[PDB]
Symmetry: none
Subunit: 215 residues, 2 copies
């Protein structure tokens, strides 16, 4: 039933570069091979330090999941990268369509970490007459760094905002920058749609950069 399948769509790390992000509760990595590794931490007085409590690896297309607890009861100490993957024993290998519900929260955490990185990864970059425009891989996040210094931000929750170089939210000059922002956004979206036509499995069309900073 529609009740036995997780809420998020299967994640995927298309065009996302290696990155290692760390909160107080988790280390999360996108690896060179596109896989997502989540190392959830638990502080262990016994060792007086964070320990890797459990690990969730997710394939670059979101369909294959491995979830286990390393050395249960104590886990592993934190290193500069996630631990290597030991050959799976089977009962720690799940897939997207049958992932049990008790593991959905971890998977959703991965989807969200991937969402974040996608929201900061430029897919189309364009030099307008007024500023450097960047459409992110999410197709919704977008910003312009104006040569003057101002900045326009478009996000899925607030819409378009514009700021001065130090970050104060500016006002008829705003009407001008905002209008230019809409225009660039649409151009970048059109560039993106246009380029999918030339895309093949062997040859990519992104990330793309058009024009250059004037002088």
């Amino acid at each position: 039933s529609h009740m036995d399948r997780i809420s998020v769509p299967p994640l995927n790390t298309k065009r996302l570069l290696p990155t290692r992000y760390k909160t107080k509760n988790a280390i999360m990595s996108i690896l060179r091979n596109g896989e997502v590794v989540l190392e959830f931490l638990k502080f262990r007085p016994t060792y007086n330090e964070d320990r890797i409590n459990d690990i969730c690896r997710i394939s670059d297309d979101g369909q294959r999941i491995i979830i286990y607890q390393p050395d249960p009861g104590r886990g592993l100490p934190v290193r500069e990268q996630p631990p290597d993957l030991q050959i799976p024993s089977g009962d720690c290998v799940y897939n997207y369509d049958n992932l049990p519900s008790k593991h959905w929260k971890k998977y959703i955490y991965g989807a969200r970490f991937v969402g974040l990185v996608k929201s900061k990864t430029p897919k189309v970059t364009y030099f307008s007459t007024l500023g450097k425009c960047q459409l992110m891989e999410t197709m919704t996040d977008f910003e312009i760094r104006f040569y003057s210094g101002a900045k326009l931000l478009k996000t899925p929750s607030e819409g378009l905002k514009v700021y001065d170089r130090n970050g104060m939210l500016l006002c008829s000059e705003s009407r001008s920058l905002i209008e230019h922002g809409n225009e660039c956004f649409t151009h970048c979206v059109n560039i993106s749609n246009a380029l999918e036509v030339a895309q093949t499995k062997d040859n990519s069309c992104f990330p793309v950069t058009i024009g250059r900073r004037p002088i």
Copy 2:
């Protein structure tokens, strides 16, 4: 472990009106009192029809959960309204934090149900110079019915979709017309959000500020 918990926060039916969804495997209701009632169905040859196998009731702040399994094995005939049955024992009354994982699928299903309702419930309606914009209770589902006939939809689940005057989905924005629809989308969405934000200030427990409609059909 913190990651070994239910995958949705507590639901809530704030400002949702009564409603009833029928799927092949459940009947889902939001009652007048704000309660969610999920009726799980299963076809039973012995009766030659679908029977209600079990039931899950969830309070309006998502904090109370009651699980029934009425007339076990046999179930109940489906009715057009959910009946408020006897609870076998106090063991069947849970709260959100202690709900056992064997019932998370049910709860999450309820929370999804509620999200569907919220995504179709207008919270801010604005009549612009170009269309009727509706920002929904989710704060992220947004649509404009342009007076000219175009339509623009915005959801977290599908990004942006824009339909020309002829009801055709646009694949790109080449003409001055399509580019103006996308632009109005952004401006009107920013405004409805600002309206939502500004109104909260006037909100109390005695008086509401939503749903709100600004202006009118030209």
